[PDB]
Amino acid sequence: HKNMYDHTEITTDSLLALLGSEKVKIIDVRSADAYNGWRMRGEVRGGHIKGAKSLPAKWLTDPEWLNIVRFKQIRPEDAIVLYGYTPEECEQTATRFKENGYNNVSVFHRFHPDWTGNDAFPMDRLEQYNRLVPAEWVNGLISGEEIPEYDNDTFIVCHAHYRNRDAYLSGHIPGATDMDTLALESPETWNRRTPEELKKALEEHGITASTTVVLYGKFMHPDNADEFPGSAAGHIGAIRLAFIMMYAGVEDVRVLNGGYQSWTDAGFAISKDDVPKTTVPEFGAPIPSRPEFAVDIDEAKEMLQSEDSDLVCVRSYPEYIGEVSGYNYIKKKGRIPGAIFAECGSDAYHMENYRNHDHTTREYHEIEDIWAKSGIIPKKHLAFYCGVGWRGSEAWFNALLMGWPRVSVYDGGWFEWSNDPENPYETGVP
Numbered sequence: 001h002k003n004m005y006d007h008t009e010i011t012t013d014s015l016l017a018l019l020g021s022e023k024v025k026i027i028d029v030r031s032a033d034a035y036n037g038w039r040m041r042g043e044v045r046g047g048h049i050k051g052a053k054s055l056p057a058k059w060l061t062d063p064e065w066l067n068i069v070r071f072k073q074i075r076p077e078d079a080i081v082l083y084g085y086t087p088e089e090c091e092q093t094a095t096r097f098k099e100n101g102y103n104n105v106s107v108f109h110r111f112h113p114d115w116t117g118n119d120a121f122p123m124d125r126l127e128q129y130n131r132l133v134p135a136e137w138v139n140g141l142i143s144g145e146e147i148p149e150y151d152n153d154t155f156i157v158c159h160a161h162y163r164n165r166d167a168y169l170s171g172h173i174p175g176a177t178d179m180d181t182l183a184l185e186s187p188e189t190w191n192r193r194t195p196e197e198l199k200k201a202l203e204e205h206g207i208t209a210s211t212t213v214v215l216y217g218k219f220m221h222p223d224n225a226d227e228f229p230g231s232a233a234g235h236i237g238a239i240r241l242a243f244i245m246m247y248a249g250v251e252d253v254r255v256l257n258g259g260y261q262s263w264t265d266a267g268f269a270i271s272k273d274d275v276p277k278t279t280v281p282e283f284g285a286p287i288p289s290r291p292e293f294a295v296d297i298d299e300a301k302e303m304l305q306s307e308d309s310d311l312v313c314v315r316s317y318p319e320y321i322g323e324v325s326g327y328n329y330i331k332k333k334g335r336i337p338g339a340i341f342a343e344c345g346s347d348a349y350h351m352e353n354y355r356n357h358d359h360t361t362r363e364y365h366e367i368e369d370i371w372a373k374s375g376i377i378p379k380k381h382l383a384f385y386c387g388v389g390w391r392g393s394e395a396w397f398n399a400l401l402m403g404w405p406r407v408s409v410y411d412g413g414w415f416e417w418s419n420d421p422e423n424p425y426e427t428g429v430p
């Protein structure tokens with residue numbers, strides 16, 4: 001019946017008439033960063049067609065491509081409409097759908113410049129997308145080239161890791177310097193360090209409050225059998241450090257979307273130099289400048305008693321039901337009573353529910369809709385937490401990117417909560 005290699009074109013008028021159809025799935029095959037709003041071809045309006053889902057053509061080489069599509073609830077009985085910067089970029093995706101039994105597949109040729117160039121055509125974007133940067137933006141930054149969403153004259157690219165300098169020395173973005181997560185958080189409490197420590201640490205790494213800091217980490221397949229599996233979850237650590245730096249007072253913090261893998265996926269050169277630090281004498285702002293980003297245990301207890309506040313438990317399901325603690329250095333098992341569960345992923349060192357297979361952030365509409373089903377909504381003051389505040393920082397960053405007005409991280413997490421034998425806790429399947 002179908003032709004695997006000749007695809008029907010859908011017109012702008014036809015697509016306009018189908019924008020509200022529940023039987024139609026509009027699929028943006030560009031990069032997730034363009035989908036979020038980055039104007040990667042110089043378009044005046046960035047983002048995606050309103051209601052479109054993100055399925056980057058880059059993922060076509062992934063052997064799990066069909067499961068990704070099914071996990072996104074894109075079904076063979078749906079009418080599939082693909083679009084990219086050009087219709088030619090949609091051809092391989094269209095063929096891939098037809099090869100897997102999707103018989104209703106069309107290609108929209110006029111997204112750019114026709115759709116982007118007229119304000120009558122509805123578009124959407126991740127409100128604070130410029131904090132989540134693509135690899136091309138970082139490459140222009142370190143090359144001293146004109147890049148959008150950047151009006152500063154001072155920057156530093158920071159490769160985060162947890163007591164694992166090999167994560168940096170085995171390959172890093174050229175010119176980048178490494179920051180151990182221990183520089184900004186204490187091994188005694190696994191909370192952010194005191195203001196005086198953060199001031200010294202940031203200065204010794206060459207960071208002022210007015211320095212644009214670009215953070216990223218390297219995913220190295222964490223294994224629960226290792227003594228420090230967090231040494232392999234570099235990009236969670238990067239977002240954890242982004243939280244602490246923004247809390248401290250760094251005005252412009254960016255995160256490389258997808259971490260190190262996005263840098264090498266783009267084909268850019270890597271460096272193995274051990275770049276020395278260029279310290280700065282004065283941070284230049286009071287620390288912390290944004291204390292409302294952090295929540296501690298007394299306020300967290302209040303938020304459990306408030307109508308417009310909630311704690312969001314970003315742990316794994318075995319941790320939530322008290323089957324495991326999730327950590328080799330925590331013996332207590334259980335959960336904070338009254339918190340809203342938002343499953344992070346498989347265990348304490350993986351964020352499958354918040355990431356794509358290439359570690360870029362999951363399509364934010366999916367995060368937003370799943371959160372809303374559990375009452376995790378922006379009208380509340382939300383304190384994301386987990387074991388020790390790493391996974392909660394990554395969840396918190398996703399909400400911050402959506403422009404949510406009062407989102408925090410409860411730093412202490414299950415570690416601090418369970419360390420007080422007076423605190424109530426639950427266990428078992430709810």
Ligand SMILES: C[N+](C)(C)[C@@H](Cc1cnc[nH]1)C(=O)O
Pocket residue numbers: 162181190228229230231233236327348349387388389390391
């Ligand atoms: C605070 N450290 C770095 C010790 C944590 C960080 C962490 C990563 N995923 C959940 N927590 C650890 O590695 O167990």
Ligand SMILES: [Cl-]
Pocket residue numbers: 217218219220232233234235236237
């Ligand atoms: Cl990671």
Ligand SMILES: [Cl-]
Pocket residue numbers: 313315320334335336339414
């Ligand atoms: Cl918990």
Ligand SMILES: [Mg+2]
Pocket residue numbers: 048049050051052124125365
């Ligand atoms: Mg949208």
Ligand SMILES: [Mg+2]
Pocket residue numbers: 189190191192387388389410411412413
């Ligand atoms: Mg903590």
